[PDB]
Design a protein around this ligand. Sequence first.
Ligand SMILES: *[C@@H]1O[C@H](CO)[C@@H](O[C@@H]2O[C@H](CO)[C@@H](O[C@@H]3O[C@H](CO)[C@@H](O)[C@H](O[C@H]4O[C@H](CO)[C@@H](O)[C@H](O)[C@@H]4O)[C@@H]3O)[C@H](O)[C@H]2NC(C)=O)[C@H](O)[C@H]1NC(C)=O
Ligand SMILES: *[C@@H]1O[C@H](CO)[C@@H](O[C@@H]2O[C@H](CO)[C@@H](O[C@@H]3O[C@H](CO)[C@@H](O)[C@H](O[C@H]4O[C@H](CO)[C@@H](O)[C@H](O)[C@@H]4O)[C@@H]3O)[C@H](O)[C@H]2NC(C)=O)[C@H](O)[C@H]1NC(C)=O
Ligand SMILES: *[C@@H]1O[C@H](CO)[C@@H](O[C@@H]2O[C@H](CO)[C@@H](O)[C@H](O)[C@H]2NC(C)=O)[C@H](O)[C@H]1NC(C)=O
Ligand SMILES: *[C@@H]1O[C@H](CO)[C@@H](O[C@@H]2O[C@H](CO)[C@@H](O)[C@H](O)[C@H]2NC(C)=O)[C@H](O)[C@H]1NC(C)=O
Ligand SMILES: *[C@@H]1O[C@H](CO)[C@@H](O[C@@H]2O[C@H](CO)[C@@H](O)[C@H](O)[C@H]2NC(C)=O)[C@H](O)[C@H]1NC(C)=O
Ligand SMILES: *[C@@H]1O[C@H](CO)[C@@H](O[C@@H]2O[C@H](CO)[C@@H](O)[C@H](O)[C@H]2NC(C)=O)[C@H](O)[C@H]1NC(C)=O
Ligand SMILES: *[C@@H]1O[C@H](CO)[C@@H](O[C@@H]2O[C@H](CO)[C@@H](O)[C@H](O)[C@H]2NC(C)=O)[C@H](O)[C@H]1NC(C)=O
Ligand SMILES: *[C@@H]1O[C@H](CO)[C@@H](O[C@@H]2O[C@H](CO)[C@@H](O)[C@H](O)[C@H]2NC(C)=O)[C@H](O)[C@H]1NC(C)=O
Ligand SMILES: *[C@@H]1O[C@H](CO)[C@@H](O[C@@H]2O[C@H](CO)[C@@H](O)[C@H](O)[C@H]2NC(C)=O)[C@H](O)[C@H]1NC(C)=O
Ligand SMILES: *[C@@H]1O[C@H](CO)[C@@H](O)[C@H](O)[C@H]1NC(C)=O
Ligand SMILES: *[C@@H]1O[C@H](CO)[C@@H](O)[C@H](O)[C@H]1NC(C)=O
Ligand SMILES: *[C@@H]1O[C@H](CO)[C@@H](O)[C@H](O)[C@H]1NC(C)=O
Ligand SMILES: *[C@@H]1O[C@H](CO)[C@@H](O)[C@H](O)[C@H]1NC(C)=O
Ligand SMILES: *[C@@H]1O[C@H](CO)[C@@H](O)[C@H](O)[C@H]1NC(C)=O
Ligand SMILES: *[C@@H]1O[C@H](CO)[C@@H](O)[C@H](O)[C@H]1NC(C)=O
Ligand SMILES: *[C@@H]1O[C@H](CO)[C@@H](O)[C@H](O)[C@H]1NC(C)=O
Ligand SMILES: *[C@@H]1O[C@H](CO)[C@@H](O)[C@H](O)[C@H]1NC(C)=O
Ligand SMILES: *[C@@H]1O[C@H](CO)[C@@H](O)[C@H](O)[C@H]1NC(C)=O
Ligand SMILES: *[C@@H]1O[C@H](CO)[C@@H](O)[C@H](O)[C@H]1NC(C)=O
Ligand SMILES: *[C@@H]1O[C@H](CO)[C@@H](O)[C@H](O)[C@H]1NC(C)=O
Ligand SMILES: *[C@@H]1O[C@H](CO)[C@@H](O)[C@H](O)[C@H]1NC(C)=O
Ligand SMILES: *[C@@H]1O[C@H](CO)[C@@H](O)[C@H](O)[C@H]1NC(C)=O
Ligand SMILES: *[C@@H]1O[C@H](CO)[C@@H](O)[C@H](O)[C@H]1NC(C)=O
Ligand SMILES: *[C@@H]1O[C@H](CO)[C@@H](O)[C@H](O)[C@H]1NC(C)=O
Ligand SMILES: *[C@@H]1O[C@H](CO)[C@@H](O)[C@H](O)[C@H]1NC(C)=O
Ligand SMILES: *[C@@H]1O[C@H](CO)[C@@H](O)[C@H](O)[C@H]1NC(C)=O
Ligand SMILES: *[C@@H]1O[C@H](CO)[C@@H](O)[C@H](O)[C@H]1NC(C)=O
Ligand SMILES: *[C@@H]1O[C@H](CO)[C@@H](O)[C@H](O)[C@H]1NC(C)=O
Ligand SMILES: *[C@@H]1O[C@H](CO)[C@@H](O)[C@H](O)[C@H]1NC(C)=O
Ligand SMILES: *[C@@H]1O[C@H](CO)[C@@H](O)[C@H](O)[C@H]1NC(C)=O
Ligand SMILES: *[C@@H]1O[C@H](CO)[C@@H](O)[C@H](O)[C@H]1NC(C)=O
Lengths: 432, 432, 109, 120, 120, 120
Amino acid sequence: WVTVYYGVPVWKDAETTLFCASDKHNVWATHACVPTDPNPQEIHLENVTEEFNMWKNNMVEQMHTDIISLWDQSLKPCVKLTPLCVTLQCTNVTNNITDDMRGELKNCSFNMTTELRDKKQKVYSLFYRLDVVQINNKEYRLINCNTSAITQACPKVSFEPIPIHYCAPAGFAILKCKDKKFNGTGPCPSVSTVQCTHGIKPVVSTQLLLNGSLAEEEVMIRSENITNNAKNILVQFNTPVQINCTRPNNNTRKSIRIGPGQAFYATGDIIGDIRQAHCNVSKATWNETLGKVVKQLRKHFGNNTIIRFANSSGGDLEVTTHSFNCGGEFFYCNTSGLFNSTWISDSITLPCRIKQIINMWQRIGQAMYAPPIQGVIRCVSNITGLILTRDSTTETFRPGGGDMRDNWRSELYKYKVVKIEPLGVAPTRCKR
Amino acid sequence: WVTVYYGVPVWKDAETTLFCASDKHNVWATHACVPTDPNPQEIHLENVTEEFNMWKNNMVEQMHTDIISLWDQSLKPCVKLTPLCVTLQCTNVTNNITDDMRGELKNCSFNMTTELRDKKQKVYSLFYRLDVVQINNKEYRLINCNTSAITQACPKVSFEPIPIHYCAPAGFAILKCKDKKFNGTGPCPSVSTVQCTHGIKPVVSTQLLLNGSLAEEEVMIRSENITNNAKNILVQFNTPVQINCTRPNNNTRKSIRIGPGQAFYATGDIIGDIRQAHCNVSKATWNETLGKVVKQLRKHFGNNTIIRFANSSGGDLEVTTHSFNCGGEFFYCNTSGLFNSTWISDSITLPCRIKQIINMWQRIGQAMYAPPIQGVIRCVSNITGLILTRDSTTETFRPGGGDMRDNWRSELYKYKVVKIEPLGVAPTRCKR
Amino acid sequence: DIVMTQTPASVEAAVGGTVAIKCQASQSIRSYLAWYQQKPGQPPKLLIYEASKLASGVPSRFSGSGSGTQFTLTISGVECDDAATYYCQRNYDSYSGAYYPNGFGGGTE
Amino acid sequence: LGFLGAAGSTMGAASMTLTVQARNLLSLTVWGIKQLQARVLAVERYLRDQQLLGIWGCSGKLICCTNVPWNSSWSNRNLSEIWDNMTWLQWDKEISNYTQIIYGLLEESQNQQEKNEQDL
Amino acid sequence: LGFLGAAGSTMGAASMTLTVQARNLLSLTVWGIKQLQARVLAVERYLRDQQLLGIWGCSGKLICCTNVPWNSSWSNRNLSEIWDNMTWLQWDKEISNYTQIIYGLLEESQNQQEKNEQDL
Amino acid sequence: LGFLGAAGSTMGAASMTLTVQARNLLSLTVWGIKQLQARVLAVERYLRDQQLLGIWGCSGKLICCTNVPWNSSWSNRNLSEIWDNMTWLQWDKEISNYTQIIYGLLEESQNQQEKNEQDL
Ligand SMILES: *[C@@H]1O[C@H](CO)[C@@H](O[C@@H]2O[C@H](CO)[C@@H](O[C@@H]3O[C@H](CO)[C@@H](O)[C@H](O[C@H]4O[C@H](CO)[C@@H](O)[C@H](O)[C@@H]4O)[C@@H]3O)[C@H](O)[C@H]2NC(C)=O)[C@H](O)[C@H]1NC(C)=O
Ligand SMILES: *[C@@H]1O[C@H](CO)[C@@H](O[C@@H]2O[C@H](CO)[C@@H](O[C@@H]3O[C@H](CO)[C@@H](O)[C@H](O[C@H]4O[C@H](CO)[C@@H](O)[C@H](O)[C@@H]4O)[C@@H]3O)[C@H](O)[C@H]2NC(C)=O)[C@H](O)[C@H]1NC(C)=O
Ligand SMILES: *[C@@H]1O[C@H](CO)[C@@H](O[C@@H]2O[C@H](CO)[C@@H](O)[C@H](O)[C@H]2NC(C)=O)[C@H](O)[C@H]1NC(C)=O
Ligand SMILES: *[C@@H]1O[C@H](CO)[C@@H](O[C@@H]2O[C@H](CO)[C@@H](O)[C@H](O)[C@H]2NC(C)=O)[C@H](O)[C@H]1NC(C)=O
Ligand SMILES: *[C@@H]1O[C@H](CO)[C@@H](O[C@@H]2O[C@H](CO)[C@@H](O)[C@H](O)[C@H]2NC(C)=O)[C@H](O)[C@H]1NC(C)=O
Ligand SMILES: *[C@@H]1O[C@H](CO)[C@@H](O[C@@H]2O[C@H](CO)[C@@H](O)[C@H](O)[C@H]2NC(C)=O)[C@H](O)[C@H]1NC(C)=O
Ligand SMILES: *[C@@H]1O[C@H](CO)[C@@H](O[C@@H]2O[C@H](CO)[C@@H](O)[C@H](O)[C@H]2NC(C)=O)[C@H](O)[C@H]1NC(C)=O
Ligand SMILES: *[C@@H]1O[C@H](CO)[C@@H](O[C@@H]2O[C@H](CO)[C@@H](O)[C@H](O)[C@H]2NC(C)=O)[C@H](O)[C@H]1NC(C)=O
Ligand SMILES: *[C@@H]1O[C@H](CO)[C@@H](O[C@@H]2O[C@H](CO)[C@@H](O)[C@H](O)[C@H]2NC(C)=O)[C@H](O)[C@H]1NC(C)=O
Ligand SMILES: *[C@@H]1O[C@H](CO)[C@@H](O)[C@H](O)[C@H]1NC(C)=O
Ligand SMILES: *[C@@H]1O[C@H](CO)[C@@H](O)[C@H](O)[C@H]1NC(C)=O
Ligand SMILES: *[C@@H]1O[C@H](CO)[C@@H](O)[C@H](O)[C@H]1NC(C)=O
Ligand SMILES: *[C@@H]1O[C@H](CO)[C@@H](O)[C@H](O)[C@H]1NC(C)=O
Ligand SMILES: *[C@@H]1O[C@H](CO)[C@@H](O)[C@H](O)[C@H]1NC(C)=O
Ligand SMILES: *[C@@H]1O[C@H](CO)[C@@H](O)[C@H](O)[C@H]1NC(C)=O
Ligand SMILES: *[C@@H]1O[C@H](CO)[C@@H](O)[C@H](O)[C@H]1NC(C)=O
Ligand SMILES: *[C@@H]1O[C@H](CO)[C@@H](O)[C@H](O)[C@H]1NC(C)=O
Ligand SMILES: *[C@@H]1O[C@H](CO)[C@@H](O)[C@H](O)[C@H]1NC(C)=O
Ligand SMILES: *[C@@H]1O[C@H](CO)[C@@H](O)[C@H](O)[C@H]1NC(C)=O
Ligand SMILES: *[C@@H]1O[C@H](CO)[C@@H](O)[C@H](O)[C@H]1NC(C)=O
Ligand SMILES: *[C@@H]1O[C@H](CO)[C@@H](O)[C@H](O)[C@H]1NC(C)=O
Ligand SMILES: *[C@@H]1O[C@H](CO)[C@@H](O)[C@H](O)[C@H]1NC(C)=O
Ligand SMILES: *[C@@H]1O[C@H](CO)[C@@H](O)[C@H](O)[C@H]1NC(C)=O
Ligand SMILES: *[C@@H]1O[C@H](CO)[C@@H](O)[C@H](O)[C@H]1NC(C)=O
Ligand SMILES: *[C@@H]1O[C@H](CO)[C@@H](O)[C@H](O)[C@H]1NC(C)=O
Ligand SMILES: *[C@@H]1O[C@H](CO)[C@@H](O)[C@H](O)[C@H]1NC(C)=O
Ligand SMILES: *[C@@H]1O[C@H](CO)[C@@H](O)[C@H](O)[C@H]1NC(C)=O
Ligand SMILES: *[C@@H]1O[C@H](CO)[C@@H](O)[C@H](O)[C@H]1NC(C)=O
Ligand SMILES: *[C@@H]1O[C@H](CO)[C@@H](O)[C@H](O)[C@H]1NC(C)=O
Ligand SMILES: *[C@@H]1O[C@H](CO)[C@@H](O)[C@H](O)[C@H]1NC(C)=O
Ligand SMILES: *[C@@H]1O[C@H](CO)[C@@H](O)[C@H](O)[C@H]1NC(C)=O
């Protein structure tokens, strides 16, 4: 009566280790990743359903620890700048500036070690205001002198995002859901199977989500709990909004030897006038896109609810501004110029600041020093979504953001990992 | 005629790699150890015998190298104290002391590096006499300045023992012998099989064996060779002897920054009077326990042999005193108050010293600095056995000890690792 | 791929009586069935969407319900303005994941 | 249909795709060490399934029939209903809690027939 | 009796526990890397035993009978004595030094019967 | 002759050395980590070949015969020529580009005969 079958098409939810596939020694060691399967076959599954939960998806946790581990490994074999944490003697940069840049740059002189242990040299460099702390012309310290070590990033290792594909080991499969009305949880009927996902760009940002995937059928609004004001709301656009960012100053760079075999890259002088860094967003596009978000957002509050976007909530720059990583520079842009409307029933210019000393993972640990880059940086990118948080007829939303194990969460919401279980039994009418 | 059988219950002696199972980032990385099998099944083997040799047991060698490797890995990502090896200017601590502590603590001032490379600060701290060496008030060096590097142990990593279970890989099995009269070598008939052993606490000590397993049927005395005076004798009690140890002084601690992101923990001042560290053992319990050891020890010498325990043999503290690791402090206690009797036909107080610079594995290599601990330490522990060495009617025994690849040897004596060999053949009366 | 069959063909009733029209599918289209009314010479008017919701401009005599693979359109009473055929439209594509108005079954008065 | 193409299909019909699923079960930086973990895991899982089929006397077959009787208490259904009106995912849930019973019976029943070859 | 429960038992009686032992043969810090060593070793040993059974024509069986004659010089004993009055540990010691002879004979004798299927 | 001793020999004659080659297929410093790579690779390759033989119904045999017809378009030669006047290296080159055809036919033809046991 008992017949044993092998190769039965069933599975259980499971957690396993995923490995990557992809495609000059960049920050994510993509040359160490296996080659992709070109033209992989996607297999649609007819007459199946499955349940998903993007807020409990362990693929997010692996992407989180993979990116952090890679960041730290890549910065490990790089020159330390410990000898640079000295008393600095600084004055203001005033010779060729606009008023908006007055006080933004400082000219600092200091006594630094030469390759010979017994000799010192007088050198100077420029620093941005945000990296320099006054002690009492005036004496200064770098911002991390009493908190952590500063390591200079290696100049040969780039940071631009490179798509990384996550692949399951044999015996496991990835279920991708196509239901275009899926809100992040529960039954999601249009399921297909892939062995390895498409590439995801490991972009790190706050408030605005850049260079991600787009929605199609509608703007999607997803949250763990809509009525819980302690949770974030992820909004995915079905159209991109284009932005253009610039340095715009023409920078120079010089090397200082600080010991045998090691050098520090100092910001040199500036060619031409000094102007403030900034980002432009097309105004009409932003105006229309925001209206689409509101129409859809109202479905969870009522047709008589007024939606206001107020302003940024306040706090440290890392959580109040738009953290933008581009061209090898770290930008902190003022988004109050975007989120300024109330909804009832040209270009926008966002002034932006630059920092060289970066605490990338919002932790106390080794800080990275971004070496200066010569020439002029020009960045073009797509806003694919945004993060909102919510504070009796008017609801208030704010950019919020700042959370890690987010952003990537908007790319991995479509996937679940399952374990294949080939054996099973059933009754029939045979005997040996 | 030839029949081949698979799954035949036979084995050969073998050596393989064992892995652990167990159960806050402690020194043995127990969070990296796999979970245990709850309520594991022990299987008694009827009508078998096996031979064991605890002196040739390779499980001891693996425990030895696992503990050392873990110790070194755990202390690796910790602040180095190299900048502390400076000329110290010291005076005696005299303000609130008893006579027994006169000269035990010194008050040392020194010129140490601040987070800025170009600034120095005058700081002071207290040190124990045993960690400070006079050069020529008076000038001093730390004990390891001309021998090794000093690394401060990380304050978040605890040292109390945590049971570790050793598990065999599939295809291997561990044979545990229950013969309660087993002397460490030869046939041991009461054999049972387990897949993984019970937990063993990685306690490091000398002279007295603390928090181990107990004997039952009798006090067991084991040695590689009883008549060889170059060998140690391990004595396992069938009852615990309780001891209570104390700091007893109320200590404070302060942090000194010694460079960006790094700090040294200095012993601060002392609240209340300064008294000598000490351990108490119940006297009656010690008196009775020692008599039991003698009765059994005599069986290997004769009923007309007198047994004397003399005193400690002399040498460096690490091999003459009771090395005791508890509360995060390192104690070196005087055991001459215990081993003081001759056997023919209240509490005991043992004065004890404290050191902060520890050469844990009796090797020249990196030394560990134990940071100060605030408040008052109180330790309670079980003496489960002891180590004796032996020097014409009187035999003399002394605490001896000091050997590594010992202590754990008293926990692993019960186990042997074997390899399962499922194939074999035999004649019968069948053909194809 | 898409199977939609309207079965109670050629049903009519006198004014004041009632009628019902029903459709079946070989694939579930839970809550994604739309009903239309087509009077001669006119484009179809949307009556009911998402199985049971009435479209704006639709009289209260129209109703309906269903789930899965079984759905019905009902008229609470004939008012002599029912001179139309009715159609079933599927608003869910099981292969693409999209929810657009692809595929009809129908033709019953 | 492709790998798991039959997952939503009738249990009977799905028996003809057993080859397709079986065919796809077997295979110091961040993206480096994970590949030893990925490969060791794939191998161990493959072998455990083969080991059970070997023990039960099903080596070399996608479909094997044995002499263990069906105990109706495991599922009070007829054959027409499970083979024609149910999928494998549904069936697996229905009798998942008897898996260990069936497996113990299947292995004992194999050894009982090996001793019977002592006579040939 | 449990795993190796029959180790001290009569060779004949112990044949009924072959399932029990077979069933238990298959599966960058200090306690980390040792697990790849533990798993790779378990897999290789399992597979080598299966490979030999495959080569000798014993695939899928705990007990297999072949046509190789017994050479009495390997052990001058009758069957009553080894099957009723001896354990497997004892037997293994007695003929351990002929293992390589038996295995060579067993594999050659299998290939010699594969060529005989050239006629079917 | 020894391992690969028959590599230059006639295809027919070489069939009697299949045992010899099969027998030898299965098994943090610079010379350290390479051994996990060496062992994992040896195991995966061994198992993939065994998996295919299992699927085609050839488990446990060095030589297995199946019911798939020979399509002469793959090689327009008679049997006398390939078995007596050719080596295996030469044969492998001649039909290397049909390997995937033969394998697909071999596996489908096995499942088609498993359903036929539904009647026993
Ligand atoms: C969102 O996606 C867009 C599109 O991919 C992305 O914009 C692109 O960024 C790259 C990298 O910053 C730009 O490439 C540079 O172009 C300049 C001008 O020709 C070159 O000089 C640069 O070469 C130097 O830097 C290299 C990297 O360190 C060195 O290897 C090289 O030797 C030189 O020193 C480099 O080629 C690219 O032009 C833009 N594309 C557009 C249309 O602007 C954007 O950055 C993404 N968003 C985010 C947040 O990353
Ligand atoms: C032999 O076994 C005994 C029994 O297990 C063992 O004695 C125990 O030692 C631990 C650790 O020293 C004691 O636990 C402490 O208790 C005090 C008082 O409440 C706490 O303040 C301590 O907390 C601090 O330290 C922790 C570890 O660094 C920190 O994580 C924490 O945040 C605090 O800073 C700690 O809980 C325990 O009380 C005793 N038990 C008894 C009965 O005394 C003995 O040490 C073992 N022998 C040897 C040689 O180890
Ligand atoms: C930062 O300060 C230095 C030192 O005063 C400036 O460099 C000097 O520039 C003058 C010309 O204006 C030269 O004659 C000197 O020889 C330069 N000195 C050195 C040491 O190079 C520098 O221009 C200032 N930078 C900015 C942005 O103001
Ligand atoms: C910004 O959005 C546009 C529009 O989707 C992207 O352009 C498309 O890129 C894909 C992939 O190469 C092409 O198949 C489409 O045909 C392009 N569409 C158009 C209208 O040109 C563009 O790549 C996005 N930018 C970034 C940085 O992601
Ligand atoms: C170690 O020496 C220091 C320095 O003399 C002592 O600290 C001083 O204590 C007096 C009070 O008795 C204060 O007025 C001073 O301001 C303290 N000086 C500093 C630098 O703190 C310290 O008490 C001595 N420690 C011991 C144990 O004797
Ligand atoms: C010191 O010895 C006592 C006596 O054996 C230990 O107390 C026993 O602990 C076990 C395990 O928890 C219990 O099952 C017994 O019932 C306890 N016996 C008594 C009389 O209470 C005690 O744990 C030992 N101390 C240390 C540090 O190991
Ligand atoms: C999904 O379910 C439908 C039934 O609701 C299946 O359709 C049947 O297919 C068989 C052939 O396998 C036909 O004989 C029946 O007449 C069909 N039923 C109907 C109502 O038309 C469909 O095959 C299933 N999909 C899959 C992949 O198995
Ligand atoms: C250990 O040896 C004894 C014999 O000394 C075994 O006892 C025999 O068991 C069989 C059944 O298996 C009985 O028929 C005999 O009559 C028993 N002999 C005697 C003298 O009573 C015992 O079974 C062996 N233990 C194991 C686990 O095999
Ligand atoms: C190499 O090729 C030669 C032929 O050129 C083989 O010699 C033949 O061997 C068979 C026996 O296997 C004899 O019956 C023939 O008569 C021999 N031919 C000649 C011309 O003498 C030789 O055996 C081949 N070597 C190997 C290893 O196969
Ligand atoms: C430099 O900047 C400070 C503000 O931080 C301002 O008070 C001071 O006047 C400036 N000095 C010069 C010369 O502009
Ligand atoms: C370098 O050291 C000298 C010491 O006399 C000091 O006068 C000078 O100001 C220091 N220069 C800088 C740039 O710190
Ligand atoms: C010094 O530490 C304080 C926090 O205690 C911090 O606010 C300040 O910015 C630090 N300054 C420097 C130069 O590290
Ligand atoms: C998603 O939709 C389901 C109904 O299909 C609902 O129960 C669930 O609460 C929704 N989730 C969120 C986050 O709104
Ligand atoms: C932003 O727009 C202004 C005109 O309002 C223009 O002068 C500036 O160059 C633009 N900046 C960028 C980065 O496009
Ligand atoms: C960005 O620059 C391109 C030219 O390179 C221009 O066509 C585009 O309109 C600019 N986008 C915005 C938002 O200004
Ligand atoms: C642009 O924003 C204003 C509010 O500032 C709003 O009234 C207007 O409708 C918006 N335009 C579009 C196209 O959404
Ligand atoms: C907008 O937010 C910024 C950052 O928190 C704050 O400095 C500014 O005063 C706010 N402006 C208004 C009008 O609330
Ligand atoms: C953004 O600009 C406004 C002026 O419109 C200013 O009041 C606000 O402080 C700026 N935000 C930040 C974070 O600097
Ligand atoms: C927001 O809009 C008001 C006009 O309604 C304007 O006065 C204010 O400056 C705007 N805020 C920002 C940050 O641009
Ligand atoms: C910066 O100035 C130098 C002057 O020699 C010029 O060659 C270079 O092209 C300029 N770079 C940019 C981006 O304007
Ligand atoms: C300090 O201790 C030494 C012994 O090492 C002793 O000779 C000296 O007199 C003591 N000094 C004081 C002030 O007690
Ligand atoms: C610090 O250095 C000065 C140099 O003049 C010396 O006089 C003083 O004694 C030193 N202090 C200490 C505590 O070593
Ligand atoms: C210096 O080395 C000798 C051994 O040559 C040792 O006895 C002494 O204690 C050491 N002193 C210091 C401060 O390291
Ligand atoms: C243990 O006992 C055996 C006798 O059973 C004896 O031969 C052996 O020497 C003893 N071992 C020791 C260390 O005394
Ligand atoms: C040891 O015993 C003495 C009494 O003789 C008592 O004063 C002391 O506190 C005890 N110490 C400990 C650690 O129990
Ligand atoms: C240790 O302290 C406990 C109280 O915590 C006491 O009951 C016990 O008798 C003491 N043991 C000894 C040996 O003094
Ligand atoms: C305690 O030790 C003395 C020797 O100092 C001995 O005579 C006495 O018998 C011992 N008591 C017990 C109970 O063993
Ligand atoms: C006891 O041993 C210690 C340490 O070796 C020694 O200093 C002391 O003098 C000895 N006492 C006697 C009485 O032998
Ligand atoms: C132990 O105490 C005695 C006094 O009874 C003393 O002579 C001996 O030197 C001390 N032992 C050690 C190691 O200090
Ligand atoms: C040993 O006992 C004698 C009395 O017989 C006593 O005088 C001596 O001080 C004791 N030794 C120790 C270390 O307590
Ligand atoms: C040490 O002294 C402080 C004085 O503020 C007191 O709060 C603390 O409880 C004391 N600790 C102990 C163990 O006596």
